[PDB]
Amino acid sequence: GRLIYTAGGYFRQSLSYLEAYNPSNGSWLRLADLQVPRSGLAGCVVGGLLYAVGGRNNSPDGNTDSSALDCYNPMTNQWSPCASMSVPRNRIGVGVIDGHIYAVGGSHGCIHHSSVERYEPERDEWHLVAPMLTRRIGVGVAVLNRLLYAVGGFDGTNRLNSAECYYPERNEWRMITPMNTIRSGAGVCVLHNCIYAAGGYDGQDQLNSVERYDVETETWTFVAPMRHHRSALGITVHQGKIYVLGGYDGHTFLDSVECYDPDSDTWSEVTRMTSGRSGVGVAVTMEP
Numbered sequence: 001g002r003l004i005y006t007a008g009g010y011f012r013q014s015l016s017y018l019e020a021y022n023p024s025n026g027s028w029l030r031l032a033d034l035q036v037p038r039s040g041l042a043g044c045v046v047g048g049l050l051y052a053v054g055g056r057n058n059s060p061d062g063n064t065d066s067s068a069l070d071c072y073n074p075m076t077n078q079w080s081p082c083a084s085m086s087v088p089r090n091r092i093g094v095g096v097i098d099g100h101i102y103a104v105g106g107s108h109g110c111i112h113h114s115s116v117e118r119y120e121p122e123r124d125e126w127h128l129v130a131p132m133l134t135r136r137i138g139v140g141v142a143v144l145n146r147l148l149y150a151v152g153g154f155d156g157t158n159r160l161n162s163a164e165c166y167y168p169e170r171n172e173w174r175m176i177t178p179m180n181t182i183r184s185g186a187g188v189c190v191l192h193n194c195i196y197a198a199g200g201y202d203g204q205d206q207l208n209s210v211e212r213y214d215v216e217t218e219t220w221t222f223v224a225p226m227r228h229h230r231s232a233l234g235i236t237v238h239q240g241k242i243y244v245l246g247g248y249d250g251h252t253f254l255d256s257v258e259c260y261d262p263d264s265d266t267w268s269e270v271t272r273m274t275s276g277r278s279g280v281g282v283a284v285t286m287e288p
């Protein structure tokens, strides 16, 4: 598409912000608020529509995990509710295959889900599929060659270096090689033939390291680290480069946005969000 959209997030409380960054000119645009504040959500795009999935509203008047799916139309600048999921999922991971949205893991109160469900926009309906082999919240999810990957997270007791792959035509999950680092709340995306895992929380410290999984070799290799340690960052890919947005570094909620160029193996700061925040949902689509 053309713009990087960041939805929701957390600073002092869950946020309703929707804002769009244009890499071509540096500009930020503030768009229509979410109907309900939420942090720990995921964003994705299908057919030119932005989707905000899951999360939690951490507010003065109580804390509510979200099962919500909401749809944003850039042409109209209006959010609309979509069918809710079977279960609330805070710290969710999402991926898109063949126009279907997969919602992975996340938490509801003290329940850490291994369950997974799939949304079909043409029917506005969610169906459960096979659950993951491991409960995961703060899981990173990405898609490559019509396969879905769940990376890292927290199972309710331990933070994880493990990862697994979902094979849709077999409705089956299989473990892949574990990462070299334990990561909860990492940004996970795909570029070329690799699954990238950036930042996160390893139990003791927020991370700046970044590693990538080559699906052909089945090995993880570290690349250059980000300039800022961060967990609960937003990530996306835009014209062959990785963007990381916000996060928590153990001291500050970051407004920093960094961009990774895989050809030079370098990160640079490219812009700042209008305010620091973690737990945002991010996606890329057309300009409104």
Ligand SMILES: O=C(O)[C@@](O)(c1ccccc1)C1CCCC1
Pocket: 009, 010, 039, 040, 091, 185, 231, 232, 247, 248, 278, 279
């Ligand atoms: O990294 C984190 O777990 C968070 O930033 C977060 C916040 C909102 C949603 C997900 C995650 C923590 C909030 C309390 C301190 C940091």
